[PDB]
Amino acid sequence: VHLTPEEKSAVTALWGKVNVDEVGGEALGRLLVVYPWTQRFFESFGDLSTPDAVMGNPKVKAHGKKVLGAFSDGLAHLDNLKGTFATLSELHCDKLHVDPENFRLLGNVLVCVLAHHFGKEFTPPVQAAYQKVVAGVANALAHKYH
Amino acid sequence: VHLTPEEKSAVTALWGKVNVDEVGGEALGRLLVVYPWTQRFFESFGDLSTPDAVMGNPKVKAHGKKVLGAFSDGLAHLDNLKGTFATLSELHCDKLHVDPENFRLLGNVLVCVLAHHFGKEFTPPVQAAYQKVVAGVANALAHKYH
Amino acid sequence: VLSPADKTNVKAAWGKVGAHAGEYGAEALERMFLSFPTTKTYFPHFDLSHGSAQVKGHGKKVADALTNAVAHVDDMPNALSALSDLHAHKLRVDPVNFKLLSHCLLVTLAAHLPAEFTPAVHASLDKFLASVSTVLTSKYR
Amino acid sequence: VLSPADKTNVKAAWGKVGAHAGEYGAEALERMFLSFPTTKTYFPHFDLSHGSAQVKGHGKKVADALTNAVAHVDDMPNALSALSDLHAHKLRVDPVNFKLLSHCLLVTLAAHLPAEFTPAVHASLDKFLASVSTVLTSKYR
Ligand code: HEM
Ligand code: HEM
Ligand code: HEM
Ligand code: HEM
């Protein structure tokens, strides 16, 4: 992903402060609340009928953790997102049947969640760098679709 | 773009039958009628109040041919769209200020016009292959935007 | 909003399609699956091979709903209420895909009705499919 | 369609923004220009350097218009009418760009209102901005 070293160090530094056990849950939760149609993939997660039922759902929180762990791992290999996500891309296509547009929706929610937690420190330049990262991740998760 | 050799060949054979004067004029003119806001970039072409005036505008027609000329050059350079359309991308961004999103519009219009001309011969597989070309051209025209 | 000229253009265009609607519906679906493979994720249960019967049959349902919409052009939200219900609460197709099907329908029409697919008619059918799309996603949230 | 709860959520959130609207609008625009540079094509004549006085002034105009939509949340198409004609006949910005600015407004609000930017509020504001964008885009053709 075309990232300047000014972008990569800024991205990486912020990431250092992220509590993945919380942000992943917030991000998955907000996806399900703001874009309620994405709930079609998580029916086995139980009650998702109100914002509190979603945000506090423990299956949502646990799953958000896995998403972010895989995300973090992508930040460790920004020069090879495709390879890094190849098998996840195959799974989401062939087994889970998930429309890749949902990867872009999640990316944008993550950016909002980053904003919320970091405030002023989520500067416009820092945002611009994260937007490139989340589009790169979205593209890589979409690459094995056929 | 990832083209199959029978996709590379489906595209090439059909293009050899295209009347560039007619198809260019029609693609650009339809862009201006179907998506009226694109007229913002061609105020000096003249009268574009109605569809008949648009389709009858000699400058639209002449400009339509030029565009499809550049597009033809791209078909011969399919393994290097980026380098082929680099100067043109620069021009479209720094001199003309054209939102690249318009490239996608023209592309889709172009695909409809081909279908209009070739009927039965513009089969689903043939369309699929042209959809990749059109996307590849749009993405290459957008490459030098900053 | 659809103008009187648009409604006229669309009833005209659709009138010719006539008894071929089911076939164009299936054709549109086939072109969408091949041109835009992500759309296949919404039909994991369908046999998507060329000419298969699920696509055939489903093509007919799509076309029929469109005929309903043409016949009720001045009254779409009402005529399409139940379909809109079904899309928002059960199918839940991401809004971007409506643009892709819409485009494939236009291509299908251009290719089967060359004399009827003038620029003004191309403009009205695009506005019409967008209006239908707006209606089917109107109750998503 | 906005629901009673949405309207309540938007009034509350915009109420806390208060007299910070202009400045949140200019920040939104700066965020948009940097993250989605294709949007700069609509502002070739503007100085877009950080702190630009033109960007600040324009941010205020955007925020004033949002404030008027919130003031007339039950009559938005009519309160925004003049703005909607301007967009359709003069400005002529491609609809996709509206999603890009809306997203940047939300980031700006989340970065400044930690306590009020709860999930339901975020949901409501995202709907509100989508409805504003639809109004401003409704007379394009
Ligand atoms: C940043 C993008 C994403 C990443 C990195 C990611 C990663 C993962 C991982 C690691 C798993 C577990 C894989 C396994 O069970 O073997 C998973 C499962 C899943 N993902 Fe995602 N995912 C992403 C986005 C999405 C989104 C947007 C959706 C749909 C809205 C989605 C739908 C699912 C579903 C349904 C499962 C299986 C849930 C279950 O256990 O029942 N994913 N994802
Ligand atoms: C298929 C993608 C496109 C290609 C290959 C293309 C190609 C060209 C070419 C070859 C020129 C001539 C420039 C010169 O004289 O050196 C041109 C000019 C121009 N293009 Fe494009 N074009 C494309 C799409 C668009 C679209 C979608 C727009 C806006 C909707 C646009 C806006 C313009 C404008 C405003 C000019 C200058 C017109 C004038 O001379 O008054 N282009 N383009
Ligand atoms: C022009 C807009 C569309 C219309 C008018 C339309 C119409 C319909 C109709 C009439 C049905 C059958 C409903 C019933 O059982 O009574 C249906 C089902 C369905 N539609 Fe569409 N549709 C549209 C767009 C799309 C899009 C864009 C997709 C996804 C790419 C999609 C995917 C589906 C799916 C998955 C079903 C259920 C299929 C099944 O399992 O039987 N539709 N639609
Ligand atoms: C929430 C959506 C938006 C609102 C409420 C809004 C509001 C406004 C207002 C009040 C004006 C000043 C009009 C006047 O002269 O009275 C304006 C102008 C303008 N807007 Fe926006 N706008 C929106 C979205 C956009 C977006 C998406 C773009 C393109 C990226 C854009 C680009 C422009 C441009 C280029 C001008 C004219 C600048 C100049 O030359 O003075 N706007 N808008």
**Nearest by Cα to D100 from C44, B79, A108:** A108
Q: Count CB atoms within 10 A of the CB of residue D75.
A: 11
Place of tokens 């620029």: C119
Report angle CA B73, B107, B31 to the nearest 5 degrees: 115
What torsion do the CA atoms of A87, A91, A92, A95 make, to the nearest 10 degrees?
170
How far from the centroid of its chain's Cα atoms is residue D12's Cα? 16
* Ligand 4 site, residue D46, Cβ cutoff 6 A: no
Both tokens of B41, joined, read 């970039």
Could you tell me if the CB of B68 is within 6 A of ligand 2? no
Q: Architecture of D1-141 per CATH?
A: Orthogonal Bundle (1.10)
Q: Please tell me if residue D44 touches chain B, with a CB cutoff of 8 Å.
A: yes
Query: For residues D30 and D20, what is the distance between their CA atoms, to the nearest angstrom?
Result: 16
Q: Give nearest CA residue, ligand 4 atom 37.
A: D91
Q: How far is the CA of D62 from the centre of ligand 4 (A)?
A: 7
B102 to A87, C9, C29, D36, D133: CA distances (angstroms): 34, 25, 25, 15, 19
List the one residue out of D58, D30, D117 whose CA is nearest residue A123.
D30
Structural contact between residues B3 and B137, judged by C-beta atoms closer than 8 angstroms: no
How far is C2 from A142, CA to CA, in rounded Å?
36
Which tokens in the block code for residue C132? 């239908």
- Which pair of structure tokens corresponds to residue D128? 């509100």
Q: Which long-range contacts (CB under 8 A, 24 or more apart) does C37-43 make?
A: C37/A145, C37/A146, C38/A99, C38/A100, C38/A101, C38/A142, C38/A145, C38/C97, C39/C97, C39/C100, C39/C101, C41/A93, C41/A97, C41/A98, C41/A99, C41/A145, C42/A97, C42/A99, C42/C91, C42/C93, C42/C97
Q: Resolution, rounded to a tenth of an Å?
A: 2.1
Judged by its nearest atom, the ligand closest to the C-alpha of residue B101 is: 2
Contact A12, A94 (CB under 8 A): no
Of D37, D44, D97, nearest to B145 by CB-CB distance is D37
DSSP letter (8 states) at residue B43? G
A141: containing domain: 1-146
CB atoms within 10 A of CB B132: 17
Q: Which amino acid is at D91?
A: L
Return the ligand number nearest the Cα of D54: 4
Contact D110, A112 (CB under 8 A): yes
> Number of folded domains in chain B?
1
Contacts of B142 in chain D (CB under 8 A): 38
C76 within ligand 3 shell (Cβ under 6 A): no
Spatial distance between the Cα atoms of C31 and B132, rounded to a whole number of angstroms: 13
Q: Please state, in angstroms and as integers, the Cα–Cα distance from residue D45 to each residue in B120, C130, D31, D54, D91, following that order.
A: 48, 33, 18, 10, 14
Backbone angles phi, psi at A78, to 5 degrees: -60, -20
Report the alpha-carbon distance of residue B41 to residue B32 in Å, rounded: 10
Nearby residues of C74 by Cβ (< 8 Å), 6 or more positions away:
C7
Report which ligand 3 atom has the smallest distance to the Cα of C101.
Answer: 27
Residue ranges of domains in chain C: 1-141
CATH number, domain at B1? 1.10.490.10
Residue B41 to residue A32: CA distance in whole angstroms? 40
On whether the CB atoms of residues B146 and B92 are closer than 8 A, the answer is no
**Shortest-distance atom of ligand 2 to CA B44:** 41
The full DSSP string for B76-135 is TTGGGHHHHTHHHHHIIIIIT---THHHHHHHHHHHHHHHHHHGGGS-HHHHHHHHHHHH
For chain B, state the CA radius of gyration: 15
